[PDB]
Design a protein around this ligand. Sequence first.
Ligand SMILES: CC(C)n1nc(-c2ccc(NC(=O)/C=C/C(=O)c3ccc(F)c(C(F)(F)F)c3)cc2)c2c(N)ncnc21
Ligand SMILES: [Cl-]
Length: 255
Amino acid sequence: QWALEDFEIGRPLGKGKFGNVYLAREKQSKFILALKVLFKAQLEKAGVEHQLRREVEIQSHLRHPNILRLYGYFHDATRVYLICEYAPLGTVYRELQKLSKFDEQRTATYITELANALSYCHSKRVIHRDIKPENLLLGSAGELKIADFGWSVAGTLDYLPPEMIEGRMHDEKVDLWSLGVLCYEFLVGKPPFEANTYQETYKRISRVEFTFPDFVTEGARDLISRLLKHNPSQRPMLREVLEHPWITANSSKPS
Ligand SMILES: CC(C)n1nc(-c2ccc(NC(=O)/C=C/C(=O)c3ccc(F)c(C(F)(F)F)c3)cc2)c2c(N)ncnc21
Ligand SMILES: [Cl-]
């Protein structure tokens, strides 16, 4: 029902391949938000029309504080427009470049917010990803928000669990593996399986080979070792992560 004439456009927040993201403002309420413009050309060049169909109807019927909200959408027969929540503080990725690594307080809270978001997703029968730092945005108070970034703004091997790479079947447990890769990146400043080649990285993931720098504490080492298990069924539940000693002792956001 929306139309482009309903919005004022500000500066470009990101130019990508499929399109751009602009700062915008609904004319009636003066509400600030983000507007994605997707080119039907590039959508036509590839085959995602059905894939585009999916995400939208889902994200629409999806309301949670740690999940970027999608408000609406519309088209003009050459372009596709998405209306999203605007997240003023930017990307967790850029923060990690600025600070190098996070402290246990900051990390424990991020993990808490991610676990809550993921647990909501599971309840609505949904499995997301790859929750890479570049797909994690920040609200005005500093609170994390899962975007499921369109790449309108690594490799992606570093965040995939063993079962997904090797060709085997996978379930909700893939999210617990991601959570542990992320927890480690937050405290150390790089993912635990990073390497100069795709081959070595593969090898380290499938064989779960990684180590800690001295400064990582035992309660941290403990939670990460429990998420990073080759056998998916041996990975904890989201619920047990929220109640972990290291989490409860360092997180400022309640479960
Ligand atoms: C750069 C800055 C930091 N930035 N970026 C955002 C931002 C956050 C989320 C999105 N959402 C999407 O892109 C969704 C795309 C798709 O569902 C999709 C579906 C089917 C496809 F085939 C595809 C395709 F990619 F294959 F085409 C995509 C977009 C921008 C943002 C924000 N909301 N607030 C503040 N700053 C912000
Ligand atoms: Cl092993």
